[PDB]
Protein: Carbonic anhydrase 2
Organism: Homo sapiens
Amino acid sequence: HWGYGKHNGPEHWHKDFPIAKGERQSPVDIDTHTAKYDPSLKPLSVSYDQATSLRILNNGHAFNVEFDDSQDKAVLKGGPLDGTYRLIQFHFHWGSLDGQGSEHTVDKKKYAAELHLVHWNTKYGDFGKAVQQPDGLAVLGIFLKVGSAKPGLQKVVDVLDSIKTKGKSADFTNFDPRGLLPESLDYWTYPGSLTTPPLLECVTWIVLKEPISVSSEQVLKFRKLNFNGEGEPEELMVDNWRPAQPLKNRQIKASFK
Ligand SMILES: [Zn+2]
């Protein structure tokens, strides 16, 4: 019964998920002056040309755009990563106001939203096995700021009315996630965790420096979603972000000078 309310929000999660107070929790604040350039990192390889989206689901905490992850069709490689990571889903975190919503922060700055493209390491066979490993997942995080619209987001925004409430899904084929990426792949990377329960410490985070712009109208549509199920009291799906956690014994590395 975790969520983002007063009585069940991030500050409560540790009671059911003690790993919430662990050594490599996410998100974190990215202190840009203390991140260090690492010349031995590579460029990221983001290979989404064969991506096969299937469905969009309101799971009660966010909406997930799900992919076919039964072959190496949309993969992330390179950067800090060893081996091949398959795209399974993406989702967002966002605020009630444009001044908050991101999970990671940059010099304490909060963005209006944050996109998470979730990938699992093929050496572990399935997502469920991958999340039990320290190098199981790679999550590409992309900040959203409010300004110009993102044309490649509009197909997502337009289906949201059909998945208003928890448990609703809709077919969502032929969506191209390349239309959600910024121009630059410059990034920061560090070892962390899922940002939702069970908070497993299985993620190599790759957070892009360049935000994407979305319009106020696009984010407004996110904010019409509901945390509740149909026929339950309406609670808008807003402020579905975990705040920054202690960095502890971690260094954030930069791919760029
Ligand atoms: Zn997320």
Remarks:
- Residues 1-257 form one domain.
